[PDB]
Design an enzyme around this catalytic site. Structure first.
Site, PDB file in Angstrom:
ATOM      1  N   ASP A  56       0.694  -1.138  -0.085  1.00  0.00           N
ATOM      2  CA  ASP A  56       0.051  -0.006   0.034  1.00  0.00           C
ATOM      3  C   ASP A  56       0.913   1.151  -0.038  1.00  0.00           C
ATOM      4  O   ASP A  56       1.782   1.505   0.887  1.00  0.00           O
ATOM      5  CB  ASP A  56      -0.826  -0.012   1.284  1.00  0.00           C
ATOM      6  CG  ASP A  56      -1.723   1.333   1.328  1.00  0.00           C
ATOM      7  OD1 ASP A  56      -2.727   1.374   0.289  1.00  0.00           O
ATOM      8  OD2 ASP A  56      -1.495   2.220   2.149  1.00  0.00           O
ATOM      9  N   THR A  89      -3.157   6.879  -3.832  1.00  0.00           N
ATOM     10  CA  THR A  89      -2.025   7.874  -3.485  1.00  0.00           C
ATOM     11  C   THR A  89      -0.932   7.232  -4.064  1.00  0.00           C
ATOM     12  O   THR A  89      -0.086   8.071  -4.570  1.00  0.00           O
ATOM     13  CB  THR A  89      -2.036   7.505  -1.894  1.00  0.00           C
ATOM     14  OG1 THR A  89      -3.214   7.717  -1.174  1.00  0.00           O
ATOM     15  CG2 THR A  89      -0.898   8.408  -1.342  1.00  0.00           C
ATOM     16  N   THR A  90      -0.535   6.279  -4.515  1.00  0.00           N
ATOM     17  CA  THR A  90       0.641   5.675  -5.187  1.00  0.00           C
ATOM     18  C   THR A  90       0.664   6.524  -6.548  1.00  0.00           C
ATOM     19  O   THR A  90       1.817   6.795  -6.947  1.00  0.00           O
ATOM     20  CB  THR A  90       0.398   4.088  -5.440  1.00  0.00           C
ATOM     21  OG1 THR A  90       0.348   3.519  -4.208  1.00  0.00           O
ATOM     22  CG2 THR A  90       1.808   3.756  -6.285  1.00  0.00           C
ATOM     23  N   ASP A 383     -28.871  20.202   3.357  1.00  0.00           N
ATOM     24  CA  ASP A 383     -28.280  18.765   3.367  1.00  0.00           C
ATOM     25  C   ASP A 383     -28.939  17.841   2.333  1.00  0.00           C
ATOM     26  O   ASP A 383     -28.131  16.983   2.030  1.00  0.00           O
ATOM     27  CB  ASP A 383     -28.614  18.289   5.092  1.00  0.00           C
ATOM     28  CG  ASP A 383     -28.238  19.390   6.030  1.00  0.00           C
ATOM     29  OD1 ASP A 383     -27.465  20.333   5.706  1.00  0.00           O
ATOM     30  OD2 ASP A 383     -28.340  19.236   7.042  1.00  0.00           O
TER      31      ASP A 383
END
Lengths: 517, 76, 521, 66
Positions: A56, A89-90, A383
């Site tokens: 990860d 993220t990588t 909302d």
């Protein structure tokens, strides 16, 4: 000696070398983990009793300490991906590292400040995002089922709120206010009118744009074929602060005459408006009687106290703009509105705008009993709309296997030609950084990355090609036929985050040494 | 003490100029004056000069002393 | 933005060469002006040499750096063209090198620097030419005054009254008034021990450096005589095989003398057939010019003989007499002979000089052979050097007419005008012209420093006075301050300053064009 | 003889453009070499501009774009 506590500014040469190389080195920690076929990385503790192996990228980045401040900055900027998407993220780190490496190579070839490089990266990122948006596909078929799901979600969200008075009616209103927009679902495109004199169940739906605080003293109540331009001028209450000023006058009459002359001086700017072909004028501040008469003589409608939010929303719906001065006649952007009507809702004046140019907005009228009920209804509607907007963000996908990335690289390369020479290099560098991702994906898969990358580039360049990387067979296959697609949101967020991270470090000249922890 | 390895002005040899060479010349002349001062005046004292072989001579004649005085310096 | 990668690092080598050249220039700078400091150098042979001459200092320094040696070539060119100011050109080169280094520190490409410096040098030359004081070669008095002014700075002071007209006449003999380029090497200076400084002769023809026949019967002079140049010797044949003369009794002397006399008589008859009465034989280290029997036979023929003539003297005689050298007696003819009204030896103690007059050869050049006399070696050396300097000054005036007052005034004027003009320039050109103008002030600064005057005060006074004057206000050693150098008789030819500027610009361009060095072995 | 081409790097850039065109209609393995040859050809005007003392990168990029 400067600063202290082991936190000192490094030499310019070494500072830039760190800022670029160390930041790029962060990618090497996660480059091997890119793609489903990525490699594993071993993280060893000092005691060696808690070592573990993981693939990860986020875990690798957050677990391995980074002494270089540039790596810390890069990781901190890339962290936005986890909150925005929670995955990829990588990819963000790898793309940022490749962009930084390309920028470093450009600087070594220019030895000039990277501000031009930053501008080129901005342009290339904009072009790539436009291409990605063009290459996206919609999986929202059977919109009737989506509408039913939106109705159910709205009903679920309206529970325990003041809007529960007419659950079905308010669910339908909320669903319509999102569906009928056919575009951006941001609350800025949805207007809420809060008036008293009825029950919340009597709320009405108006697709038009409605404002409050009607304008004008001698202005007409109806405007047709309006040419709308917004300006920020002080046409009322000029010379706001004059206390303490000495006036070379014999009486207050001459001071009033001087103020009148100052007001008249604005007549040049007022007249300049007519040279733009404008028949409707909107001003953020109030308009005095004299400028109102001047506009009337020119046949220009005068709208007063447009503030900021009203101005922004009116420009957005009409596609206009707001300026502060009129430098040259015939040079401006004008909005359009077919009909403008003066109406009163709940004994309160309002302005109704209809036929706005490409207008994409909806309005909901609330009839409450007190301020608390109206405020609660507005908050509940906000909302519910926010919850319902999720449907307009999902189902947006792009071709996987690097097809979308290769198309974006081709678009950037195209942009590299219709640009000045001093920025074509930066655009090409951004294109190369985009192309680096499929190369790393092929390398992690254990196949000949160069051959696959070249074949994919040739296929994509040679017209309507949907081919992509086949990480299972190590060849080139049609992604559309195989159904290999990836989320559009993920790719857009990754590219935007990588561009922002590259920009953050590019603008840095020197970096101060990080304090060891 | 002496200047060397200037790393610049690559000539056939070393270069000394300015205050250093001025002081060197002044010191050489002062040394010569100190050597020859003792012979000034009829009441002065003589000095002994020794050659490189092992012989020596004693005289109070300033001219002879200066002629036989070996000074290895341009000021000398 | 994007610019050239500049992967290589020629800047290191360029800066090292510039540093070496600037060090050499700074070393040579302190010798500028009459009050320049003396320099002492110990040669590889141990000799100690003290001199204030820039060229001599550069030669004795034994420069090893290939680029720094360019200053030696610059000084040689200045001497060949200007004849003076070798220190000024080196100082200008150093100042321009410093300016180039500063420009490089600003990121300006070396080629830009070189081109801009060339343009600035051209502009400076034009500016200086525009403001020069015009002179005319037809004014003999003006040339005499200029020569006297130039000679006043030498050891010889009272004999300048005679030295100046000698130089003026010698230069005019070859330069006329519109000859444009004239080679001063056509004037030959001959030194001889004896006499005084006043004992000098111009001789419109050519003067030999050896005595006439010292044996009995030598004419020692001849009227209406033809002169030829001989490179061979009047000697009997010498076969390459074994040969020698062996005499055991006086009876063999008859045969030996008869044979030698027959051979020398054949040689002398061949010489006489051409009607050559003066024999100028080149000096040789193998055999004497003429044998004793040959000398006697020539005396019977009334033929003058001058031997031990150096090769340079033979070449000068050929240039001035209009004749050609004779390789061997077989090529000795009349067409290669001159015709002088009178060739004679001046029989006087210590001179015994043979001179040729009345050449009357249209094909021959109007060469001049000046005779220099002096009791001591110092007198003759100083006289020769002063005469050479005066001849060079007059030649520079001939090539480019005009006089410029000294003391750094033209440098300050050029700097001011270039500073004013550069405001109209754009780009790197304006900056480089400003740097060039700033560097031009080096010469007056060096003059002030060497003269013991305050540099700032001197330069400020010169600039203030230039608000009215152009070139007449400069540094004067006599007044120890800023004054009217024109009235002080401190002037130099325009050619000197123009050549100095051109040489400095060319040297800077050459140095900046160097980016690498490699060995060829 | 008497046959010439446009100077000032024009011929080099034309050759580079032709090589790039060839680089598209060829497999990747040889396409990379073709692109490398095109880059080598384009390097010549860069060096020419460098020797002339101008902005080599700007001139090269502008010429290539034109």
């Amino acid at each position: 000696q400067i600063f202290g506590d082991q936190v000192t500014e490094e030499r310019a040469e070494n500072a830039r070398l760190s800022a670029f190389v160390g930041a790029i080195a962060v990618g090497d920690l996660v480059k091997s983990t890119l793609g489903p076929k990525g490699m594993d990385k071993l993280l060893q503790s000092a005691s060696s009793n808690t070592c573990m192996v993981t693939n990860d990228g986020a875990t690798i980045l957050k677990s391995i300490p980074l002494d270089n401040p540039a790596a810390k900055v890069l990781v901190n900027i890339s962290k936005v991906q986890d909150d925005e998407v929670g995955d990829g993220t990588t990819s963000v780190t790898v793309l940022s590292a490749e962009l930084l490496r390309e920028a470093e190579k450009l600087i070594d070839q220019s030895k000039i400040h990277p501000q031009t490089i930053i501008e080129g990266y901005r342009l290339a990122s904009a072009a790539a995002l436009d291409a990605l948006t063009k290459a996206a596909v919609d999986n929202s078929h059977d919109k009737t089922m989506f509408r039913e799901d939106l109705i159910h979600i709205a009903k679920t969200t309206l529970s325990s709120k003041i809007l529960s008075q007419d659950k079905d009616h308010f669910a339908e209103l909320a669903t319509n206010a999102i569906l009928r927009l056919k575009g951006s679902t941001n609350l800025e495109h949805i207007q809420i009118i809060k008036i008293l004199g009825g029950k919340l169940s009597d709320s009405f739906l108006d697709e038009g744009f409605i404002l409050a605080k009607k304008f004008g003293n001698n202005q007409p109540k109806r405007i047709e074929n309006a040419k709308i331009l917004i300006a920020n001028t002080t046409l009322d209450t000029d010379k706001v602060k004059i206390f303490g000023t000495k006036f070379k006058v014999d009486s207050t009459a001459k001071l009033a005459q001087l103020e009148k002359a100052e007001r008249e001086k604005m007549k040049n700017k007022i007249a300049k408006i007519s040279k733009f072909g404008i028949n409707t004028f909107i001003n953020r501040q109030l308009i005095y009687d004299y400028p109102e008469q001047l506009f009337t003589d020119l046949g220009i409608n005068s709208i007063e106290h447009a503030d900021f939010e009203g101005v922004e929303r009116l420009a957005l719906v009409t596609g206009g703009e707001v300026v502060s001065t009129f430098d040259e006649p015939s040079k401006c952007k004008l909005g359009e509105c077919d009909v403008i009507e003066e109406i009163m809702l709940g004994e309160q004046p309002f302005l109704k705008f209809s036929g706005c140019k490409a207008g994409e907005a909806c309005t909901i009228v609330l009839r409450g009993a007190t301020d608390q009920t109206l405020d609660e209804a507005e908050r509940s509607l906000h909302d519910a709309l926010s919850v319902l907007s999720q449907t307009t963000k999902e189902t947006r996908t792009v071709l996987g296997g690097g097809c979308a990335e290769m198309v974006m690289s081709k678009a950037v390369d195209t942009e590299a030609q219709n640009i000045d020479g001093k920025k074509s290099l930066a655009v090409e560098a951004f294109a190369r950084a985009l192309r680096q991702l499929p190369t790393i994906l092929a390398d992690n898969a254990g196949f000949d990355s160069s051959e696959l990358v070249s074949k994919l580039r040739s296929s994509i360049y040679n017209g309507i090609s949907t081919s992509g990387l086949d990480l299972n067979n190590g060849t080139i296959a049609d992604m559309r036929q195989l159904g290999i697609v990836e989320s559009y949101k993920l790719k857009r967020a990754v590219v935007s985050s990588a561009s922002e991270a590259a920009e953050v470090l590019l603008r840095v000249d020197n970096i101060i040494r990080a304090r060891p922890r | 003490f002496n200047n060397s390895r200037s790393d610049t002005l690559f000539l056939g040899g070393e270069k000394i100029s300015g205050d250093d060479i001025r002081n060197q010349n002044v010191l050489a002349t002062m040394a010569v004056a100190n050597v020859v001062k003792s012979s000034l005046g009829p009441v002065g004292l003589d000095k002994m000069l020794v050659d490189d072989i092992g012989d020596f001579t004693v005289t109070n004649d300033g001219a002879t002393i200066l002629s036989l005085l070996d000074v290895q310096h341009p000021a000398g | 933005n994007a610019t050239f990668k500049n992967k290589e690092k020629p800047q290191e080598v360029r800066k090292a060469n510039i540093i070496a050249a600037r060090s050499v220039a700074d070393a040579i700078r302190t010798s500028l002006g009459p009050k320049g400091m003396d320099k002492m150098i110990k040669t590889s042979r141990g000799e100690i040499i003290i001199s204030n001459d820039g060229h001599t200092i550069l030669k004795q320094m034994a420069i090893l750096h290939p680029v720094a040696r360019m200053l030696v070539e610059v000084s040689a060119a200045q001497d060949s063209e200007a004849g003076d100011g070798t220190t000024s050109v080196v100082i200008l080169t150093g100042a321009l090198l410093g300016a180039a280094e500063r420009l490089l520190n600003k990121g300006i490409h070396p080629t830009i620097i070189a081109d801009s410096f060339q343009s600035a040098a051209k502009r400076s030359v034009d500016i200086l030419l525009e403001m020069c004081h015009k002179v005319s070669l037809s004014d003999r008095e003006q040339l005499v005054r200029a020569a006297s002014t130039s000679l006043s700075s030498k050891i010889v002071s009272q004999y300048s009254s005679f030295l100046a007209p000698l130089a003026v006449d010698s230069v005019l003999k070859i330069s006329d008034e519109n000859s444009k380029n004239v080679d001063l090497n056509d004037i030959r200076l001959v030194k001889k021990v004896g006499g005084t400084i006043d004992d000098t002769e111009m001789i419109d023809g050519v003067v030999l450096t050896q005595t006439a026949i010292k044996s009995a019967g030598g004419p020692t002079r001849k009227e209406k005589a033809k002169i030829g140049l001989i490179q061979f010797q009047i000697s009997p044949p010498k076969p390459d095989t074994e040969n020698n003369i062996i005499v055991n009794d006086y009876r063999q002397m008859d045969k030996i003398l008869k044979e030698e006399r027959a051979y020398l008589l054949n040689i002398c008859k061949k010489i006489k057939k051409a009607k050559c009465n003066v024999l100028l034989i080149q000096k040789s280290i193998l055999r004497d010019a003429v044998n004793d029997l040959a000398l006697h036979f020539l005396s019977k023929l009334n033929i003058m003989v001058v031997k031990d003539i150096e090769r340079e003297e033979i070449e000068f005689l050929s240039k001035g007499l209009g004749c050609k050298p004779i390789a061997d007696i077989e090529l000795f003819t009349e067409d290669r002979l001159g015709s002088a009204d009178l060739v004679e030896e001046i029989d006087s103690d210590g001179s015994k000089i043979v001179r040729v007059t009345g050449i009357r050869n249209n094909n021959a050049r109007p060469t001049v052979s000046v005779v220099i006399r002096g009791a001591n070696n110092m007198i003759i050396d100083e006289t020769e050097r002063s005469l050479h300097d005066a001849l060079c000054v007059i030649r520079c005036l001939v090539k480019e007419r005009g006089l410029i007052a000294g003391g750094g005034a033209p440098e300050i004027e050029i700097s001011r005008r270039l500073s004013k003009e550069a405001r109209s320039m754009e780009g790197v050109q304006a900056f480089i012209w400003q740097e060039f103008a700033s560097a031009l002030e080096v010469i007056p600064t060096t003059l002030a420093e060497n003269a013991g005057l305050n540099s700032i005060k001197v330069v400020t006074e010169l600039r203030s006075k230039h608000e009215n004057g152009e070139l007449n206000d400069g540094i004067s050693v006599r007044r120890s301050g800023t004054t009217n150098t024109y009235e002080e008789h401190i002037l130099q030819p325009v050619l000197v300053s123009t050549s100095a500027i051109t040489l400095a610009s060319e040297c800077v361009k050459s140095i900046l064009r160097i980016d690498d060095i490699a060995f060829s072995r």
